[PDB]
Ligand binder design. Structure first.
Ligand SMILES: Nc1ncnc2c1ncn2[C@@H]1O[C@H](CSCC[C@H](N)C(=O)O)[C@@H](O)[C@H]1O
Ligand SMILES: [Zn+2]
Lengths: 173, 7
């Protein structure tokens, strides 16, 4: 099903899956991470795109988060890939910084962003607790994870993504 | 169980 296929992107506005472009809205804008030498100790922070900022989360006791600063982020903006250490080790399942990547056919990997020198800024994106504060949707594409904006994000708003139902229960949501 | 998962 196009719904479940890695090769396809999805247009929020149209509900269309496509390979290159939505026929109505054109190709999606992927925002690049900033350049940082591989393995840099502050790699995850320094990889942050211009216009955003890592600062304490607005969620109580949630540590750091990612805020939008420069200007309105439109719907359908794409971020990623989520970087980290790829592994099947199940202690990665518990870092709290891992996304499951489905390789299809009851087999999977983890991309673990726990190590800041290996991860990118997306490790700092916190979990939405309600659909009203969620402005990012995580999804798998080309065997990797990306976040796309599912509403307009104004300056001064925290970016917030949904972690999946299992981790959400763990967070008390 | 702190594993982020897609739909
Ligand atoms: N909705 C929420 N409520 C409470 N804590 C949250 C949260 N979303 C994310 N967190 C916190 O962030 C962790 C996921 S990693 C996200 C980055 C983290 N806040 C940091 O400072 O590096 C979770 O283990 C949890 O401690
Ligand atoms: Zn469209």
């Amino acid at each position: 099903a196009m719904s479940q296929d890695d090769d396809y992107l999805y247009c929020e506005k149209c509900q269309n899956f496509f390979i290159d472009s939505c026929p109505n809205h054109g190709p999606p804008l992927f925002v690049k991470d900033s350049m940082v030498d591989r393995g840099h100790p502050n790699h995850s922070v320094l990889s942050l795109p211009p216009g955003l900022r890592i600062s304490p989360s607005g969620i109580p006791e949630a540590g750091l988060g990612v805020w939008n600063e420069a200007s309105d982020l439109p719907v359908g903006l794409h971020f990623g890939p989520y970087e980290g250490q790829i592994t099947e080790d199940e202690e990665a399942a518990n870092s709290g910084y891992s996304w499951l990547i489905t390789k299809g056919r009851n087999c999977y990997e983890y991309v673990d962003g726990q190590d800041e020198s290996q991860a990118n800024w997306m490790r700092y994106v916190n979990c939405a607790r309600d659909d009203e504060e969620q402005n990012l949707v995580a999804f798998q594409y080309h065997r990797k994870i990306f976040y796309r904006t599912c509403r307009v994000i104004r300056p001064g708003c925290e970016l917030l993504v949904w972690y999946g139902d299992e981790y959400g229960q763990e967070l008390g949501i | 169980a702190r594993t982020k998962q897609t739909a």
